Amino acid sequence: IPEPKPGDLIEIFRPFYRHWAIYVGDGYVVHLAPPSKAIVKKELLYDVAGSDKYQVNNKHDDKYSPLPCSKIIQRAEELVGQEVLYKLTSENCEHFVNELRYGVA
């Protein structure tokens, strides 16, 4: 599987649940994760994916424009360290990365 492009949405197929992250380059993604509440983390895709299959899935590019990729990366990185109080359902994780790629829904 070739290297994702900065700003790409990454859909990760964990057993019985999906997780979402956004590629920020040089092997890193930004995503919501538990400390062990949830926190925005910058981590290696290698570690976040682990042994689980994943794909790039920019599902809304058909009908919506992605933001300039420099802006996507900047916004994602600025949020690293921020905490949120909602559960890490696929839906919430997807919503988070959608906002980064496409802007506020």
Side-chain angles (χ1 to χ4, degrees):
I1 177 164
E3 189 184 353
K5 179 176 174 184
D8 278 352
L9 306 188
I10 307 302
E11 185 176 19
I12 305 165
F13 299 114
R14 302 180 167 167
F16 305 91
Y17 88 95
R18 291 182 300 125
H19 182 55
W20 289 83
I22 191 165
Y23 198 67
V24 298
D26 293 323
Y28 292 95
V29 295
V30 165
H31 69 139
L32 299 175
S36 299
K37 210 163 200 176
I39 183 158
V40 181
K41 300 193 188 173
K42 178 168 169 180
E43 308 193 91
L44 291 168
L45 179 51
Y46 179 87
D47 292 329
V48 175
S51 295
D52 301 321
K53 293 173 184 174
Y54 64 89
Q55 68 183 352
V56 171
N57 190 355
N58 295 322
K59 80 173 66 168
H60 300 296
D61 280 21
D62 202 47
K63 289 174 186 176
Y64 299 89
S65 289
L67 291 167
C69 288
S70 284
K71 296 289 187 178
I72 298 174
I73 297 328
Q74 188 181 20
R75 187 48 177 175
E77 285 183 336
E78 279 182 18
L79 293 179
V80 174
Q82 298 299 307
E83 302 187 330
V84 303
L85 285 156
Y86 53 83
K87 272 166 60 57
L88 297 184
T89 61
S90 171
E91 292 65 42
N92 288 341
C93 292
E94 186 177 358
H95 187 267
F96 174 73
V97 302
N98 277 351
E99 173 164 358
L100 293 174
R101 177 166 185 82
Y102 298 109
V104 176

